[PDB]
Design a protein around this nucleic acid. Structure first.
Ligand SMILES: [Mg+2]
Ligand SMILES: [Mg+2]
Ligand SMILES: [Mg+2]
Ligand SMILES: [Mg+2]
Ligand SMILES: [Mg+2]
Ligand SMILES: [Mg+2]
Ligand SMILES: [Mg+2]
Length: 1376
RNA sequence: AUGUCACCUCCAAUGACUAGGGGUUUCAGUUAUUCGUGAAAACGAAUGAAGUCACUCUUAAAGUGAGCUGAAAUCACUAAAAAUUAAGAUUGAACCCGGCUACUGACUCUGUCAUCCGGGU
DNA sequence: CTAGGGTGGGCAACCACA
DNA sequence: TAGTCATTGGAGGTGACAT
DNA sequence: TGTGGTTGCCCACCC
């Protein structure tokens, strides 16, 4: 045997790894290797599918609209029997855009408006009548508001401005009524439901198919739709048709267009009818909407012409219900059943004889008792496959009966086991008389000819059970039990009866009549159990502690408070309900004591009354079998069934742990195969650290802390006021992430959905709050007075810092047992400054993706790692006859931390774990080493792992610490490059955000000619001898004095010079076209406001000359025209900063005005009233600037009419695959060799030209360059188009002498070393080597630590000496 | 005490469906007429919407830029539609076809449909 | 467990050089 | 941003047995 | 009056 060992300190980002191989016992000095895996949380690897899912659903919404237009056009040209004009197509598509959401907001309450007299509100609207109720006139007011009545709208803002000061109203109410609180509530509701009408007209369309009403009003007022209207014979029929098609989901349109013959957009009536009935049979309607469902299907199924049904069926009925993807990907239950198939594949028909012989014994009386009921339901996958085949061969009822009896025999409890099979096959024996008579009984019952093989089976079974309980069923080689791999049910009534029977300790529960029994008075079992669960959920995880403390205090005779007296009343209730239940269905006393507690009664209520919300863990066969085995109405008959404990982590957790397990399996793979050994068993033990993190309240913390759903909790935390605007909020608001969704996704790859990050605000406070930061000064003053008692921002800042400073990390993470003040302090700490200690603590404590990546993920990670290492070393073990005998052990984190990490910290000071700051990278390897140091302590681990010589604490504690090697390797995974992927579509292969693509006009006046926008000096550049420009621009220009290029012809020629080799004339034309070309892009006017530091920026920043100047430089070859143009749009920016209400906030040079983006949005507003009710609102206002550019591509797509359009994007990935190498081996460092996922008849690399390359050097080709010295080792690869990658192997003392890095020993180094500009200058100065360059932004990534460092960096800028030395190394390799 | 197993409730993290509303870009349109309400400055309405400024230069006219409005496009191969913004050593997810012999789900429950199963892309 | 602004391109600005 | 549906892990419980 | 090499810095879809 060969002892191979892996120890893993699991980490959300950084994973420590200590691994070795040995012949026996401890490893040598050379065999132990320390690794640290840093998973990139800076988006070098994408684990979260959030960006991919939102891109998928954005494209799905786009294709939903595209296919809805396609279907609408097909049906309308079918109705007209003629082709639509582009104006008709534009009007129909104008109806189809912006269809609004489909949720349930059903009815505004307005109940407080019933008890308020109308005559009090004649002041705001004099036209009101006292004979008319306020509710009726309010309904008519809203009806007028929807009908685009401008007077009604003006009445709305008149009411909005008048009701903000309510001193007169409250004075009159107090003068005529005693209580003013109900009138305060009435005015609050009035101002709360009118402010939501101000919204959803300024921030979004946002209609719950009031789009139907808007389109019903806007169809007759659109003149392009007139020839359609008599074609449909009415505005009503056409509106119903449009609304019915607009309610279709993408899957319906998919099902209609899913045919190659539908590339012709042909109309098929029966296909459309079948698609519509298929579409509305797909939904799971609620119980109150079934009649509506019954209407819609009866329209669609009964259609003798589906096109008239679309015009006839009311589109309000065809609004889809909520999605019900409840059977989406159901779980497979992981119960492990004894397999008749495997048993008669291995033992033939002999195990049948074993079961028959053991059944004949009187000791096995009643072991098959309820099996005629158990065997009805299918329990496993192979039985299901045989039942689908209709040919029961291995899974007949007799074979299942015998296998069930066999497993009940083997899993029998100690009190009932008449054979002591666990003792009989154990390697250790006790007092031999009892084992002697147990073997005698087994021999007498089973038969002496069957004793050997059966016991071998028994030992195998028990071994394979034990592995199954440790999460290691997958490492068995010849299994006897099989996983079920079957979907369980979803808590139907038959499941409810079994679960309630498991609670109540009954076996044959048939109905729930006990639930309706009367306990005391008119209060049923239902009422007391609902009260019990209400109390238990009010007290949370601390309920058991406070309840048991109340019972202990009442037992000892000590005085009870009100809360403990309430708990004593609850104990009286649980005793009464337990007595009534146990008398209702005849439960005896000792079984009544097993559910006479609040928890069992509460979960009785939860099972019986609350609706089902997921699948049960096992199938009903396993539920019934476990109910038989446990025998809760009496004494337990058998041990409960075992299951494969490794539940699947399908998600981003799968991705992170998948990549970690593959990297560790690679390290273990070419650590094993680097050694040379044949035909011997290598046992490979995996060591893991138990990370169990509490996200809800712990017992050890509620003990020291005791001496509304989450959505409603966040809603009630804002106290009915919008935090960002101060408006009365109500219920039509939005839950805002204070730390923005995109920001946290960018630097963390996660969305912080913790309650502290979520604040309930309005649409105004959420749509003006973009990805930019928002501080405490942007919150409204009244909201701060309500929450913190005062609106003083400094006092609130000090209060928040002091209150959060007293909270521990756990008490912040266990968020729900703070009081209201501490919860508000933790949430509002995110509104503080960047340098705030409280905010820096809270942002880090809500990054709970890193805590969930290690929380109990050790079993699945170990399974993944062992399976991968088995498949990498499969051919190596096959070619060397190696058998790998894997193992898994798991170690308590607190034990290894206190008893080994702290001890090594005292022994070696450099090995200490920092608690107040970030851990050094090598410390993770130390933790992994500590895991190994703990695992040698355990006798069970060491007895298979090695020998036992642990004679003293100090001796082994000092002998172990020298095993860890000096150097530690730092493994940085990175995703596959876009040059190597054969599926390049699985990468975001260009950035979203399109750039405006202009060309400079040419102005001619007589002989004189110039390039620019106008004849001003700053707007043009004079061309010397312009006849050469027109000579090299024949066929590309068009005359509008002014000559402008032909956009389509220029784009076609610029694609032709990129995709195919072209003549010199076309290349010169492309050069001129690229020199007249420039790029602008609209950037928002809110960029005058700094959204991060919350201040206005100086005029020299808005009117910075780099943002507007265009450099034009042709040359004599095209007619010399050198100079700089200013962009005319700069004058519009001059309008922005010199306008009436911004010229004082923006200074000439570089106070901190709060919420300036709201001011900018108040400046730009649609003051005129829109004619059309279905019109898009606008929120973002922008002006062009010259943006900074990346590698750009022009894409030739097609518009809806079939015309070629060109849009300019930027690449997200690499554009260059390498550098062209000639026949002699010389690298062409200047030319751009574009990769082959580009170079397509649609794409055009911007300023790109065709290039032929028979051979080239790849960007990944590392070579060792001759650096002129032997102390360092310099490797170099081209890496990128403009920056080489340089890898330096160099002693750490020399690196510190070069740089001045003062991070102490190498154990305290990070994985990414950030050099200051003084340290970069020191590196360049002391290296005295221009061949090294300097690191880009001082970023150095360490590959191996130690006394000799090995680190790589991207050079800040290329340099001819690097290219020369790489050319030298490449020529040395190329000649050989 | 901690290991399985089954339930209950919370918290956190996932990924799945359905989307919504702004952006950006391309292509157009617009740089106003008519009516009645005013002596008029101006107001309102109708023209499907928009229809307002600024540099150049005969002064007009024009050029150019911006705004506004409406459509369209918003990864490529690439399309009827599926996959397509993850990973690649392995995969996962999605979507479609057939089936109801049968695991799961929804109903109007001998059955039909499906997010289920089998297969395919 | 975690202490959070990367990279693969582009541009303009100077400084030799013809 | 909004609905809806499932899963995994942990914390607090109840019940079974088994170290 | 190009032409190439360094240096310095900027960009990225949101709610
Ligand atoms: Mg650890
Ligand atoms: Mg927000
Ligand atoms: Mg660690
Ligand atoms: Mg536009
Ligand atoms: Mg069924
Ligand atoms: Mg189907
Ligand atoms: Mg699916």
């Amino acid at each position: 045997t060969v002892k191979s060992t892996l120890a893993v300190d699991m980490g959300g980002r950084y994973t420590g790894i200590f691994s070795y191989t040995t012949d026996s016992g401890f490893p040598k000095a050379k065999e132990a290797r320390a690794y640290v895996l840093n998973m990139p949380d800076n988006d070098a690897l994408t684990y979260s599918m959030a960006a991919r899912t939102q891109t998928r659903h954005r494209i799905r919404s786009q294709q939903r609209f595209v296919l809805a237009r396609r279907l609408t056009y097909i049906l309308i040209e079918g109705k007209l029997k003629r082709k639509l004009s582009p104006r008709e197509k534009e009007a129909i598509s104008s109806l189809l855009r912006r269809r609004g959401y489909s949720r349930l907001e059903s009815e505004l309450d307005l109940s407080v408006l019933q008890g308020v007299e109308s005559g009090f509100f004649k002041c705001f609207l004099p036209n009101f009548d006292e004979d008319e109720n306020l509710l009726t006139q309010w309904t008519s007011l809203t009806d007028g508001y929807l009908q685009n009545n401008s007077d009604s709208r003006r009445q709305i803002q008149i009411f909005l401005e008048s009701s903000k000061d309510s001193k007169e109203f409250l004075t009159v109410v107090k003068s005529q009524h005693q209580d003013t609180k109900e009138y305060k509530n009435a005015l609050k509701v009035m101002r709360d439901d009118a402010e939501s009408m101000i919204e959803q007209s300024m921030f979004g369309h946002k209609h719950r198919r009031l789009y139907l009403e808007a389109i019903a009003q806007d169809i007759p007022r659109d003149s392009r739709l007139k020839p359609i209207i008599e074609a449909f014979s009415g505005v009503e029929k056409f509106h119903h048709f449009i609304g019915n098609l607009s309610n279709l989901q993408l899957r319906a349109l998919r099902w209609y267009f899913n045919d190659p013959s539908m590339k012709n957009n042909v109309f098929d009536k029966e296909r459309l009818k079948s698609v519509l009935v298929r579409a509305y049979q797909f939904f799971h309607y609620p119980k109150d909407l079934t009649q509506q469902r019954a209407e819609v299907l009866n329209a669609y199924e009964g259609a003798t012409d589906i096109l008239e049904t679309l015009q006839t069926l009311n589109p309000e009925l065809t609004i889809p219900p909520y999605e019900d993807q409840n059977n989406r990907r159901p779980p497979l239950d992981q119960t492990l059943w004894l397999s008749p198939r495997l048993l008669d594949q291995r033992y033939g028909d002999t195990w049948e004889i074993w079961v028959q012989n053991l059944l004949r014994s009187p000791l096995s009386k009643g072991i098959d008792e309820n099996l005629d009921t158990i065997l009805i339901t299918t329990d496993r996958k192979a039985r299901l496959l045989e039942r689908q085949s209709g040919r029961l061969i291995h899974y007949t009822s007799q074979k299942l009966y015998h296998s069930y009896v066999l497993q009940r025999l083997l899993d029998r409890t100690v009190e009932n086991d008449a054979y002591l099979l666990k003792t009989l096959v154990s390697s250790n024996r006790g007092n031999s008389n009892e084992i002697h008579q147990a073997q005698e009984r087994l021999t007498r019952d089973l038969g002496s000819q069957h004793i050997k093989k059966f016991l071998d089976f028994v030992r195998q079974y028990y071994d394979e059970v034990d592995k199954a309980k440790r999460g290691l069923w997958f490492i068995v080689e010849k299994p006897l039990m099989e996983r079920a791999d079957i979907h369980p049910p979803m808590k139907n009534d038959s499941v409810i009866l079994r679960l309630v029977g498991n609670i109540l300790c009954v076996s044959d529960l048939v109905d729930l009549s006990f639930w309706t029994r009367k306990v005391k008075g008119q209060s049923t079992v239902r009422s007391l159990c609902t009260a019990i669960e209400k109390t238990r959920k009010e007290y949370g995880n601390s309920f058991n502690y406070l309840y048991q403390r109340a019972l202990y205090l009442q037992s000892k005779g000590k005085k009870l408070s009100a809360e403990d007296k309430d708990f004593i009343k609850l104990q009286s209730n649980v005793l009464l309900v337990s007595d009534v239940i146990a008398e209702a269905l005849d439960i005896k006393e000792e079984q009544k004591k097993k559910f006479a507690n609040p928890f069992s009664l509460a979960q009785l209520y939860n099972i019986i009354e609350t609706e089902k919300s997921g699948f049960i863990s096992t199938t009903l066969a396993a539920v019934d079998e476990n109910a038989w085995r446990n025998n809760l109405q009496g004494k337990a008959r058998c041990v409960q069934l075992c299951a494969d404990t490794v539940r699947p982590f399908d998600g981003a957790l799968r991705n992170i742990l998948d990549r970690q397990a593959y990297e560790i399996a690679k390290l273990k793979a070419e650590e094993l195969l680097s050694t040379e050994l044949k035909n011997q068993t290598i046992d490979l033990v995996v060591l893991l650290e138990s990370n169990q993190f509490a996200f809800s309240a712990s017992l050890a913390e509620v003990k020291k802390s005791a001496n509304l759903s989450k959505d409603e909790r966040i809603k009630s935390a804002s106290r009915g006021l919008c935090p960002y605007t101060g408006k009365n909020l109500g219920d039509k608001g939005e839950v805002d992430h204070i730390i923005p969704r995109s920001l946290s996704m960018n630097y963390m790859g996660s969305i912080l959905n913790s309650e502290a990050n979520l604040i309930y605000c309005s649409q105004e406070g959420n749509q003006l709050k973009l990805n930019g930061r928002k501080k405490l000064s942007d919150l409204a003053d009244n909201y701060l007075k309500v929450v913190f008692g005062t609106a003083d921002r400094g006092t609130i800042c000090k209060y928040i810092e002091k209150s959060v400073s007293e909270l521990t990390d756990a008490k912040i993470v266990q968020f729900e047992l703070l009081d209201r003040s501490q919860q508000d302090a933790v949430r509002h700490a995110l509104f503080l400054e960047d340098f705030s200690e409280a905010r820096r603590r809270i942002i880090r404590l809500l990054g709970k993706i890193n805590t969930a990546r290690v929380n109990g993920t050790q079993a699945w990670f170990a399974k993944s790692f062992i399976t991968k290492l088995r498949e990498l070393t499969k051919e190596w073990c096959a070619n060397n006859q190696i058998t790998l005998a894997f193992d898994l052990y798991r170690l308590d984190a607190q034990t290894v931390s206190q008893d080994y990490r702290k001890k090594f910290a005292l022994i070696n000071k450099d090995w200490a774990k920092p608690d107040d700051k970030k851990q050094p990278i090598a410390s993770h390897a130390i933790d992994a080493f500590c895991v190994f140091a703990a695992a040698k302590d355990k006798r069970n681990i060491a007895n298979v792992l090695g020998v036992f010589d642990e004679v003293a604490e100090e001796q082994n504690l000092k002998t172990i610490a020298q095993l860890m090697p000096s150097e530690v390797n730092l493994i940085s995974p990175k995703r596959k490059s876009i040059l190597d992927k054969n599926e390049v579509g699985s990468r975001a292969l260009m950035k979203e955000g399109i750039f405006a693509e202009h060309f400079l006009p040419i102005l001619v006046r007589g002989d004189d000619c110039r390039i620019g926008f106008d004849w001003s000096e700053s707007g043009s550049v004079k061309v010397k001898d312009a006849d050469k420009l027109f000579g090299v621009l024949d066929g590309l220009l068009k005359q509008s004095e002014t000559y402008t290029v032909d956009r389509i012809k220029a784009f076609e020629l610029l694609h032709d010079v990129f995709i195919r080799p072209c003549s010199q004339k076309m290349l010169e034309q492309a050069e001129v076209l690229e020199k007249l070309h420039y790029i602008t892009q609209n950037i928002s006017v809110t960029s005058v406001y700094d959204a991060v530091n919350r201040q206005f920026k100086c005029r020299e920043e808005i009117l910075k000359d780099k943002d507007f100047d265009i450099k034009v430089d042709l040359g004599n070859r095209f007619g010399s025209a050198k100079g700089k143009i200013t962009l005319p749009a700069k004058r519009e920016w001059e309008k922005l900063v010199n306008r009436s209400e911004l010229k004082n906030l923006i200074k000439d040079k570089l106070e901190k005005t709060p919420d300036g983006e709201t001011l900018i949005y108040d400046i730009f507003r649609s003051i005129p009233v829109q004619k059309l009710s279905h019109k898009a609102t606008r929120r973002v206002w922008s002006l062009p600037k010259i943006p900074s550019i990346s590698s750009g591509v022009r894409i030739k797509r097609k518009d809806s009419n079939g015309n070629d359009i060109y849009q300019l994007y930027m690449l997200n990935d690499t554009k260059c695959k390498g550098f062209v190498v000639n026949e002699k081996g010389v690298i062409d460092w200047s030319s751009d060799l574009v990769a082959d996922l580009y170079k397509q008849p649609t794409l055009t690399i911007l300023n790109g030209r065709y290039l032929k390359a028979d051979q080239y050097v790849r960007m990944d080709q590392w070579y060792e360059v001759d650096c002129g010295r032997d102390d360092v080792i310099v490797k170099m690869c081209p890496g990128t188009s403009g920056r080489r990658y340089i890898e330096i192997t160099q002693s750490k003392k020399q690196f510190e002498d070069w740089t001045g890095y003062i991070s102490g020993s190498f154990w305290n180094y990070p994985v990414t070393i950030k050099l200051s500009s003084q340290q970069i200058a020191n590196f360049v100065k002391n290296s005295q080597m221009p061949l090294l360059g300097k690191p880009r932004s001082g970023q150095i990534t360490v590959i191996t630590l130690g006394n000799t460092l090995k680190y790589w960096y991207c050079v800040e800028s290329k340099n001819s000496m690097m290219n020369e030395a790489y050319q030298k190394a490449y020529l040395v390799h190329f000649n050989q």
